[PDB]
Amino acid sequence: MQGDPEVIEFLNEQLTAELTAINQYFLHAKLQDHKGWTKLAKYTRAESFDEMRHAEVLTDRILLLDGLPNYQRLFHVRVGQSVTEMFQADREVELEAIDRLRRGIEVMRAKHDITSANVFEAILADEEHHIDYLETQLDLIEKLGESLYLSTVIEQTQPDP
Template sequence: MQGDPEVIEFLNEQLTAELTAINQYFLHAKMQENFGWPKLAKYTRSESFDEMRHAERLTDRILFLEGLPNYQRLFHVRVGQTVTEMFQADRQIEVEAIDRLRRGIEVMRAKGDITSANIFEEILADEEHHIDYLDTQLELIEKLGEPLYISQLIEQPDS
């Protein structure tokens, strides 16, 4: 089925964002693991995999619409050096995604591509959930301070 070029471009732009997020979250998860924060690393790694599932759905849709998924492009990967910086960087990527998804939904509905709009709406719900999590973590860091927050992430190794 031949898709609208503007819809395919929105799908590809969001695909670029998802591919960028996969890399950013995965790197943050590996850094968190290295810092000795296994609980946080596990959560961040699962977010990376969620973004991979989003990328897969977008790829499938682009191909269905007879477009070419663009895997050669990435946005800037923001790497945090502290837990606060990681959360802020991850939050920024989510804010940008939410704005892009909302604009895309409008365009897709206007062009009559309800299926693509529904895919964007499902991804939007996931991104809103993630930004809520990040906001909560940043609020906790602000209230507790980063050292106390980090102390809650540390697990003792099994003996």
């Protein structure tokens, strides 16, 4: 039971993208938490955990095919100061991930492999959901205003429910 190297390198590209996304999201969460924007921090922490789940399932599938999960390679990681630029950066990361996912899914589906294809649509569906959320947030801040929108998410105490 073995596979051709093209599917393995597709999966490894996706894995490295997921690790970089994890690091970027966690850095964003910590920075915006130090700023004082709490709800964004919680939401991006949840997103980070989701990305770890994706990385875990990808690792499982690649180790199934008797591959070598490479952890050394990383992509370019970028950070921002205001919410607009970090949202934009996450948007481009998601765009690159989804484009790579579509290309890999077509190429590998043409090879008569199925299960990796399944984990691929799972990943692309979650990425599409997150990028839609980010785009909605960007349009919201564009229409509303930076200062007041940042004032929306400030809080000091916690809710009982």
